[PDB]
Amino acid sequence: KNIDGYFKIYSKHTPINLVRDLPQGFSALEPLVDLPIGINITRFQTLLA
Amino acid sequence: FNCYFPLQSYGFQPTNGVGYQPYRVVVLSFELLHAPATVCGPKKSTNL
């Protein structure tokens, strides 16, 4: 998320056993990264291996 | 003639006067835009 130029990144890892779709459940995300950069971001992309 | 080098050299010698000695000068210019501040005061703490 972006709040007043601050980029906030929360994450959470969990072990699952499923290959079809998303396993239904509940899981919280703790605050991990907060960067005071101030870049207006409108698009993004991913990169696999 | 009529075409001189743009840069000239400093004649720094230890036997010259104070006005000819090399002086190191640093200008600290602070910029504060609408972006969040990232270089902030130390805010020295006290005992508890």
Cβ pair A14, A34 in contact under 8 A: no
Contact call for B35 and A36, based on CB within 8 A: yes
Residues of A in contact with B36 (CB under 8 A): 4-6, 36, 38
Q: What is the resolution of this structure in A?
A: 4.4
Cβ pair A9, A32 in contact under 8 A: yes
A7, closest residue in chain B (CA to CA): B36
Closest CA to A31 of A13, A7, A9, A3: A9
Ranges of beta strands (E only) in A1-49 are 2-3, 6-11, 30-36
Closest CA to A36 of B44, B33, B29: B33
For this PDB entry, the determination method is: cryo-EM
For chain B, list residues whose CB is within 8 angstroms of any CB belonging to chain A: 34-38
Residues A22, A11: Cα–Cα separation, whole Å: 17
